[PDB]
Protein: L-tyrosine/L-aspartate decarboxylase
Organism: Methanocaldococcus jannaschii DSM 2661
Amino acid sequence: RNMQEKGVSEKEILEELKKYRSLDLKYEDGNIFGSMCSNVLPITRKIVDIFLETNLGDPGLFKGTKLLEEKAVALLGSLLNNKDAYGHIVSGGTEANLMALRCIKNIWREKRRKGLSKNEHPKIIVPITAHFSFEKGREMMDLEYIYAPIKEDYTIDEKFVKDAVEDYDVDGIIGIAGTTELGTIDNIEELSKIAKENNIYIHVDAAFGGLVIPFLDDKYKKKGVNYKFDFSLGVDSITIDPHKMGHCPIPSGGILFKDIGYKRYLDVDAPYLQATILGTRVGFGGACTYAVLRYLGREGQRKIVNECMENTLYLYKKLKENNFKPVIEPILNIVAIEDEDYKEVCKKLRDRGIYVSVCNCVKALRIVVMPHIKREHIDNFIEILNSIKR
Amino acid sequence: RNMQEKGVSEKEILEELKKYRSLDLKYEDGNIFGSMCSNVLPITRKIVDIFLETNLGDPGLFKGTKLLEEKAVALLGSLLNNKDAYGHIVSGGTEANLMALRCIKNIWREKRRKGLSKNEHPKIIVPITAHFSFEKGREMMDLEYIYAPIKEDYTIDEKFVKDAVEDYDVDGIIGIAGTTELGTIDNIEELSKIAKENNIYIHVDAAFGGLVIPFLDDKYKKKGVNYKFDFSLGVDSITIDPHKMGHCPIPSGGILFKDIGYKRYLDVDAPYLQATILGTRVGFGGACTYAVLRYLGREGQRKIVNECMENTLYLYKKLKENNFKPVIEPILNIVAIEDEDYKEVCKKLRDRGIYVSVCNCVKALRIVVMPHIKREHIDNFIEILNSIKR
């Protein structure tokens, strides 16, 4: 507990650490059902070792690692239909979303300086399904949120957004491509039309879905769901998270802006003295993001994505066969189970070694069918749950 | 450049990555003289591998890794003379400083809600030597900074701070234990007295110095410099950065608060739904911080710190012997060289394979004598610099 004068041997300290690691769950063991992280692609362990002693906060010392960040951003941009994207491989979707909010706020600040805004704080339309990082941004940056309601399919109400844009002076719109709770996709096509017609910045949070949606086989796509979400719609920025469905080690997050014109709105003016929030920051995230996308190609990511979707629809089928009520038919590799007693059922599952997460907008257990979840784990989950219900 | 359909082999992608890594500098090669990062302790490569697939954003899944974060914070707290510290192993000193600023701001918000503050924004006294992360915080959180001037020894003017606290309603004070530019130590003892007498929060930025000052041999200590900076002075929070002079891999930063009473001021209220800014975040930083401090003990860190100081004073001696003007006699393992033509000299050094950094408050080259800088590198640096000056 206290700092000691004498050191200890490598064997002593590693064995102590391994005992603590033994208390953790491991993704490959069939315990973790509620996480959007999973096992990393094995090749990334070598890449982390190669790039461990780099620092993208000092890119003049690590020119090659910096070029790899640029290449990683370019490959993500290509995936998102934008060959000119300006962006960064950052610490995660939270920092990515915060940087988009900073950009929105600095566009508003410039208007305020010119007398072109009656808003004392940026006014941003955000769906109530938005990830908690948006609340962190609101709280830090003193943003004003207009919370948009969701429709019966749990996607943002586009008519509300359009009406709010007419009623108020709006500084940004947020749409979500793959919501945290249910994996639904907002109508980005319509939101982007509203945004373009009114000269409003629009950010797409595709932290999870950005590395799933582009790879979905047609049989998993649903009539009337629009899967368009990327720069082909003219959106201003997109968050996308390699350390979720990109199989990259933490920290590997992505923020892409439509072009380099946005970089100036990420400036910070220091009277007595970088676009990311962090300073010193890893170089291995960009190396891993580039390398995993190159190693797998579209073919390899498609195989993983649709294996997850196969197991997602298997879980959905088994749930209904056992008279459980999924909240929705799954869109991405996320299924939620309606249950009034969800808190207690979650704890009972936990006692039996099944770790799910629980929802906010609805009383349900959330299962994220990442690549570590196999058929036998789903079968095991159903047995344990049936047993709890007797 | 573009996303491809077909993947590539492991050999192809690793060889490509290794070519980019070949363009980087490496700490052990005698090129990097201006960085506060260095080679990691070799044991940490194994720890990163063990803990790569953990996530302190989901500590309920990684109970052991979470306990190790708590143990890492406790060891840092013990080093800083506080057995009850509440804190986190975060992404770096930037996030640490931002969390301290969030705490300061939320203490002010509570006062504002009760009518106990005439300040429309928190008013924080910050020395002009403060790290750029404080400007990032000001810009994001709409803080009002009262910039404190520095004295001839480049430390904060304590009388200015005391006078400003009488003239204005002040919500926080920042002191620096190891400035970025010169390695000087503000008079934290006096600042903490001012802060306590006026009920003002005080944060100490010891990102660099916190893992140097406690280990300095008496011969490196200077008459009249006060080396006290930690919780024995009753300060409210301290930033300390293991991935600087703690030899830990990025990301390993530290933020410690005086006690768990501060946790409530890091809350974020989400109407429709964690104390760190990041969400998903590494677990290996806490494991490495704990393990390196246990492995080295005070004895092993003292040896490294004072080896760096030996080489720092060697560099200072050689500089004067060659008629260069150091800005100050070094306090920590940082030396700066006065030069009117510092920008051009820096570029000339760069052309010769010597990478220094350059200062803000003064026209000088900054050398950070990290453990990778040995006598032969200092001798080589002096030769190249003498040559540039002819």
Q: What stands out?
A: Chain B has two domains: 1-40+298-390, 41-297. The first strand of chain B starts at residue 86 and ends at 90. The radius of gyration of chain B is 22 Å.
